[PDB]
């Protein structure tokens, strides 16, 4: 057993942080491997994540995050039984896939409302810019103010981008028909 492609992680910057790796030869991750991790901070405790299978040779871990701030950095250790396979670290804030926006409602004026999925005390609270798609062919609308609304006169879904570097688009929201 050997690591073919070293662990790589992507957090939603609040609660979850998905770490994936590929292996030389097929593994049952659920049984053979165990990935321990510890937030690099005084008097913390390491914790245990039992992985799952992404095909034969590939594994995936949903590490629980106690929220994430920029400063955070975690020590990752991959074990097979009692054999260390791999040593490493990662900052979750450094590879981000934003969570999807929420309850997309409708309303002269045509008002669309949604929920920012992050709470007031979170960094992504006021660092999300929204994209709105509008059947046959469509048209987009880039919302770049803090308010999660849109107005006009005369499928329909919403997504989210974050003011970061190693970022991507959120999944689309549940969609309504105007």
């Amino acid at each position: 057993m050997k690591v073919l492609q070293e662990p790589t992680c992507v957090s939603d910057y609040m609660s979850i942080s998905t770490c994936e790796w590929k292996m030389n030869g097929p593994t049952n991750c659920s049984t053979e491997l165990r990935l321990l991790y510890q937030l690099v901070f005084l008097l913390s405790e390491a914790h245990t994540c039992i992985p799952e299978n992404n095909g034969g040779a590939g594994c995936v871990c949903h590490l629980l995050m106690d929220d994430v701030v920029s400063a955070d950095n975690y020590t990752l250790d991959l074990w097979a039984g009692q054999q260390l396979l791999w040593k490493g670290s990662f900052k979750p804030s450094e590879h981000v896939k934003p969570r999807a926006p929420g309850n997309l409602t409708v309303h002269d004026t045509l008002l669309l409302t949604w929920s920012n999925p992050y709470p007031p005390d979170n960094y992504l609270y006021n660092h999300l810019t929204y994209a709105v798609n509008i059947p046959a062919d469509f048209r987009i609308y880039n919302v770049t103010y803090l308010e999660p609304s849109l107005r006009i006169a005369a499928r329909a879904r919403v997504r989210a981008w974050a003011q970061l570097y190693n970022t991507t688009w959120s999944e689309w929201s549940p969609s309504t028909k105007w």
Partner: antibody, heavy 125, light 113 residues
């Protein structure tokens, strides 16, 4: 309430050994990190040792590295400093304290918010 | 290790008057925004130390509204709005970011009556 009670202090010889103890009640001992602080007569506070709530990580002040030993029993709700090969300037009053909640992925620290009554170690001939 | 410099060593005051203790660390004790790791303790001689303030400016349970924390990075201040006869004792600050936990020298608070 929530209390820490210390024991195991007296007069030991230069070169001797002593074991300190910290009974703790009113919470989940295991959930929390613990810390030993010492205060020489006249002089101010001086952090000695610390340990995570699992037993996982230990932390030692330099001047006691290798000599003193931190340990805990989370079933008996007790914490120990295993003082070994003592010198004259180990003479101080020893306190223990409730440090940070460590169970959770991120520690929560609200200061050393609960203190033990103290116990004295004198190192003399 | 982080050097804490506590000032003054001696604080004579008069009951009802305001009082101040400064604390300068040799490095930043902020981890994240809102999270400075600086604490304030009082010790009445004969007694065990007790927390007044954790994480820069949070009051310990037991601590009256009179005691106020303040500061960020490397500059901390403990304010007593009106001193009282039971404020007598020794005041310590402590960084709790890196081991070893280090202590300011200490302030003797003394009432002029």
């Amino acid at each position: 309430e929530v209390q820490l009670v210390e024991s195991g202090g007296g007069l030991e010889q230069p070169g001797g050994s002593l074991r300190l103890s910290c009974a703790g009640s009113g919470f989940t001992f295991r959930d929390y990190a613990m810390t030993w602080v010492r205060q020489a007569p006249g002089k101010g506070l001086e952090w000695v040792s610390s340990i995570s709530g699992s037993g996982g990580n230990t932390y030692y002040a330099d001047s006691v590295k290798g000599r003193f030993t931190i340990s805990r029993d989370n079933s008996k709700n007790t914490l120990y400093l295993q003082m070994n090969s003592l010198r004259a300037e180990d003479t101080a009053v020893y306190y223990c304290a409730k440090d940070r909640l460590s169970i959770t992925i991120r520690p929560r620290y609200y200061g050393l918010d609960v203190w033990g009554q103290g116990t004295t170690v004198t190192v003399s001939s | 290790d982080i050097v804490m410099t506590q000032s003054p060593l001696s604080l004579p005051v008069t009951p009802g008057e305001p009082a101040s203790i400064s604390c300068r660390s040799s490095q930043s004790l902020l981890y994240s925004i809102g999270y400075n790791y600086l604490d304030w303790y009082l010790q009445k001689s004969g007694q065990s130390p007790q927390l007044l303030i954790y994480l820069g400016s949070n009051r310990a349970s037991g601590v009256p509204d009179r005691f106020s924390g303040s500061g960020s990075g490397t500059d901390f201040t403990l304010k007593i709005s009106r001193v009282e006869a039971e404020d007598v004792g020794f005041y310590y600050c402590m960084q709790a970011l890196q081991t070893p936990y280090t202590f300011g020298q200490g302030t003797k608070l003394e009432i002029k009556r």
